[PDB]
Design a protein around this nucleic acid. Structure first.
Lengths: 68, 68
DNA sequence: AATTTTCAGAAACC
DNA sequence: AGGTTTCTGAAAAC
DNA sequence: AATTTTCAGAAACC
DNA sequence: AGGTTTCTGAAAAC
């Protein structure tokens, strides 16, 4: 069997980190090979584009206001 | 040769989208296989954890204030 | 609106 | 002139 | 602080 | 009791 997974956003940062770990690595590898190891800018843009792909322009704008 | 790349954050959303495209796919695949296709929550958490991994807790808190 | 791929052309490099 | 890759936008499709 | 991997135990499933 | 995977935190290292 195995313990059922909780939602990612309900987990401790610790447990969150443990689940994304394998993707965190893929992102790292990509950031290095293609974007000069700029994980922040990559994940930021992934998220922003992910928001705008959903027409959550208001939040996307607000995060953009936060980041400069 | 080839045209030199601009910084990801200076590009049009169009051009940004074109560069991350290959990683966008990897994220999609991961989100589907491991997080019930919840790209938003994945990228959000990747970014949040990426910020806190850099002790940018203030911004991380502010994005967390935005998202609920 | 968004998405996607295709077609074009200019721009920046060789 | 040619090459290339990147950037932009439009175009034609979902 | 952060990171990492290791060790533990409890928790939730079979 | 056993199994498993997940979650949490501590522990020992950078």
């Amino acid at each position: 069997g195995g313990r059922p997974r909780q939602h990612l956003l309900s987990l401790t940062r610790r447990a969150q980190k443990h689940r994304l770990r394998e993707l965190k690595i893929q992102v790292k590898e990509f950031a290095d090979k293609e974007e000069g190891g700029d994980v922040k800018a990559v994940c930021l843009t992934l998220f922003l584009l992910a928001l705008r792909a959903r027409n959550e322009h208001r939040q996307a704008d607000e995060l953009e206001a936060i980041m400069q």
